[PDB]
Amino acid sequence: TTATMRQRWQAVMMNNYGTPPIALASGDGAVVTDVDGRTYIDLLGGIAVNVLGHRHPAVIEAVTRQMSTLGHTSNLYATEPGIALAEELVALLGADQRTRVFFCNSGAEANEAAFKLSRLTGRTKLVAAHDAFHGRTMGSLALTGQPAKQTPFAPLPGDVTHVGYGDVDALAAAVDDHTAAVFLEPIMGESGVVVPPAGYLAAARDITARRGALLVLDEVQTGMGRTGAFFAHQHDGITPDVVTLAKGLGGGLPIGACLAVGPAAELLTPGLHGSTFGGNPVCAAAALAVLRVLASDGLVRRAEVLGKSLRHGIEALGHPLIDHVRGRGLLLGIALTAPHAKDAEATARDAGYLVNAAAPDVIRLAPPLIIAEAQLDGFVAALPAILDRAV
Amino acid sequence: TTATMRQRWQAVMMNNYGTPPIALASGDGAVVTDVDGRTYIDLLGGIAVNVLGHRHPAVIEAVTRQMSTLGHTSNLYATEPGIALAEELVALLGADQRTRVFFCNSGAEANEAAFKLSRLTGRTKLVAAHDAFHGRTMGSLALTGQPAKQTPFAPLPGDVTHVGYGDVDALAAAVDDHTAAVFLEPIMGESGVVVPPAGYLAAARDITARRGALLVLDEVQTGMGRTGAFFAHQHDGITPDVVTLAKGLGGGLPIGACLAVGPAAELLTPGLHGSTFGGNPVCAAAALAVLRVLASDGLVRRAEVLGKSLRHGIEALGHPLIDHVRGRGLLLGIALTAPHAKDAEATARDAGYLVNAAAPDVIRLAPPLIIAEAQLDGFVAALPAILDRAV
């Protein structure tokens, strides 16, 4: 039962998440089942992680095959899956200069690697955006622009200046010849699927390039083809100096990556960084499978098509509680006219849909890329009642 | 070929590890095979991670079963394997007070969690040991006692004082009523399997208790029964406030944990920490299988027995290059009378054995706990020629 599982949680887990309201038992595709037998359509994908849903045969085959071949070895040894995965990610980035890859286990670790890269420029000033989320480790938490999550842990590593997201003049004013790097999400996910103004990422690329600063794009949430290009920044035709990936990279298995382009790719020399589990064969094999399915099933182009019809469908409702829909592909935010997103999260759950109240007035969707249009259509048809009940 | 694999590595990988000298293709138990078909006895376990070796049936079964049931969900949802793993780990720690668990993906992340815990004491001063290794992210790197690895990324999070490992009075002088926490490895692994004097951890527990500081024990490398007790600190009859685990926790799959005891277990409140992949069902299922096998096959006791026999056999060789053997159970250092450990690593490789030059004069062993006594016997008999060729 759900009550017993929550009691077991509260007896042993640290309370850094609160107590989960539901206990999940099984999942298949975009449908999960709780321990009481209720089914839910998963419009959140474990916070954009389950790009291929649950029990995808290609991921299961890749992981089972690799476990029965060769597991963890450490980076004292070269192994094929990590090398092939690095090759595939470099090809997908499509940069004009040599690109090199560092693997790790999480988005926070990927941004820690980028943070350390920034130190090797000889500069210590960093710029990020108010409300950005880059991770919860000491370095990535300094880049995160969420004071409630930072203040109890001060002092954090320096020297970070936060500016308004999407404000070109504010960014130009903050970046100078002492700036090691600028960190930006192409769409701010955790804060409410905040999409920047047209031209902003191109401006950021120009500002940083003129000032000798690295441009680091955090694609941990916007990557893996979710927005209809493999990297969301590719919609703007720019090439950053550093890109970080995690979440959906492994289809559920823990893996992150830091990609560095041109001179930034040579900053890390032997002995200056590492991670025991980074690039291990099983997790890399999972990520290779995800890339293969994305390509074979055309799921990147599909995410744009599904995301456009979903966005159109929500706006066509004309519900008075919805101010606007924003985002791109299958990263979508329903911005509300009143702070009822947490209530709508609960009433969606009553209706069999898993969504996220990313802000008091924003409902975030990040469904599996294998989700059926029919399942999305069903959510849109259910949404007027969900929102009515929310108030 | 090995040359082709190394050439591919050098074309795509960041150079933070250098280029691995061999490329591994498969593994089974304590034997790994490179891309040219050569087999090696794995006396390092991918740096103490492969506790049950490669292709352990129990781990394969747990992972394949869980992948076909429910994958990643995030901590927005309660799931059985993580709760069960937290229960099992709290049982193995056996603390008198309530113990709570936080899951993450790595040793660095587990010590980052402990670092953030220490902030919630209201103090910002921290103490660690010269040459200690606690990870390579910005917070854990501040704790790591290696100035050569810290200097290029300064400034690091503060305020950390380092003292000589095993020195009771240096520790007592450094710990005061402003000290948030003391971080110690029960045996310093990465620096050369450095064992502290008798009573030292007990003194650290008394010093921290009298000054109101947390004692944090990093069991990332010394845990998982490797030393003949599940946690190495249990040989000393102390209970720390915080314990961190990773490496072998998942038998190969990436998972780490921070355990906190008593008042320290209540410091983290909702929203103050998290990790997207932490506690995910597949890695937790793997870790549960490792715990089951350690218990059912009596591998903790076996580690002590085999470790004693191994140490005795190396010291019986009477080889002039061997000063002494130190460590406990199956974490061993061969301390040499001259700095030939790096050369001995290569000549051991020629003889078909994977070992680690942890220091210029220390060969580190951390074999799978399922290693065959005959595989160890063969290593001991081969060691004289390995060392002779090294010189």
Author numbering:
A (entry chain B), B (entry chain A): 7 to 397
Please give sentences taken from the publication describing this entry.
The L-arginine biosynthesis pathway consists of eight enzymes that catalyse the conversion of L-glutamate to L-arginine, appears to be attractive target for anti-Tuberculosis (TB) drug discovery. The arginine biosynthesis pathway consists of eight different enzymes ([Fig fig1]) all considered to be essential for *M. tuberculosis* growth *in vitro*.
The prosthetic group PLP is covalently linked to Lys253 via an aldimine linkage. (a) X-ray crystal structure of *M. tuberculosis* ArgD showing the dimer. ArgD contains the prosthetic group PLP that does not leave the active site of the enzyme. Therefore, all the PLP sites must remain occupied during screening experiments to represent the native state of the target. While ArgB and ArgC do not have a human orthologue, ArgD and ArgF do and the *M. tuberculosis* enzymes have identities of 36 and 41% with the human orthologues, respectively.
